[PDB]
């Protein structure tokens, strides 16, 4: 019983950053070997845990939050960061534990792409994980842009450990 990472990383449709969706993964084998050894990833950064130890530790559950953003804002999906996305679309908690995975999706998402939206105007700051749907602007991703403008698909795997059986373990 392997965890449904394919439903997170091999999905055809991704949420926009202003309205990111998520999957809750539990009661399965979290074989992370599939992800950290993947040649599709441009970046992979973990907070509080080394990637090579992910298969040696258990969680109550994990949350896979996924969305598409422009490449030069990939650095904002981290604790302690600021910026329009960090502040008004996906607030990443400063005590975050988990891994952030991202890759270049230019060959899937760009168009010769008025689909993915992010916030421009938000009256106040978000608290961690508080997605809000209600102002918004299209990225308009193109096939002929630099890496900072090309779309990067992002998956954030947060790790939750509670007074629970801890059923999400690697091999």
């Amino acid at each position, epitope marked *: 019983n392997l965890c449904p990472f394919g439903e997170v990383f091999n999905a055809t449709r991704f949420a926009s950053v202003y309205a990111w969706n998520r999957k809750r993964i539990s009661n399965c084998v979290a074989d992370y070997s599939v992800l950290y050894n993947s040649a599709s990833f441009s970046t992979f950064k973990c907070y509080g845990v080394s990637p090579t130890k992910l298969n040696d530790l258990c969680f109550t559950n994990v949350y896979a939050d996924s969305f598409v953003i422009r490449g*030069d804002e990939v650095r904002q999906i981290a604790p302690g960061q600021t910026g329009k996305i960090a502040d008004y679309n996906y607030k990443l908690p400063d005590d975050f534990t988990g891994c952030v995975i991202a890759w270049n999706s230019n060959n899937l998402d760009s168009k010769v792409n008025y689909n993915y939206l992010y916030r421009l105007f938000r009256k106040s700051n978000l608290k961690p994980f508080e997605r809000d749907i209600s102002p918004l602007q299209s990225y308009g991703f193109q096939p002929t842009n630099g890496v*900072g403008y090309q779309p990067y698909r992002v998956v954030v795997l947060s790790f939750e450990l509670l007074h629970a059986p801890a059923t999400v373990c690697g091999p």
Partner: antibody
Amino acid sequence: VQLVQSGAEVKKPGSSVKVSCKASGGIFNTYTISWVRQAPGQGLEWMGRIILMSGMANYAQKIQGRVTITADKSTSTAYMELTSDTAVYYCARGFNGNYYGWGDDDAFDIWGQGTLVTV
Amino acid sequence: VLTQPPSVSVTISCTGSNSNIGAGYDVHWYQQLPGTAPKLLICGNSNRPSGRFSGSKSGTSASLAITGLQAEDEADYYCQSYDSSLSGPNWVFGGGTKL
């Protein structure tokens, strides 16, 4: 951590060279190896980086198609090889103090000795 | 390429663009003594490894501050940052300043 590179060598111009680099220190926090070169009297130029886990590597556009980098997990080495200058080629591990793994905002902290290749 | 003064007798400047420094990406600093590989002195905006130095960013520019004319640290200083243009990820080192 320690990164040991190859010694100096001379090749005929137009030929190929293979430069090894072995991360013998530990390899426990090394996820990626980058290569940077420095021509005599010049500054440093990034040439490429390989992620040891995935085997994927990115390259500077100016040398694309004539450079390859191979990660050999079994020996903890990264091979930098070129086809078809007299620059010094340095091996360095990527590192970031805020997170484990690799990314764009990381830095090259531990550098090898530098292998010169001349014609 | 990041622009730097050929030499400084103090502070070492580093000027880029909004595709690399004004982009928000971290600017790292190195000290290269002749005969060897460069040593990192600043990671991120202003963190440092064990073993006098500070720095900051402003707009599309960044700078390294070295205080005290100690010994003879006539090293070649370089700035490094991630460039988000071209047609793919690349890292850029500055021209290099002799101190």
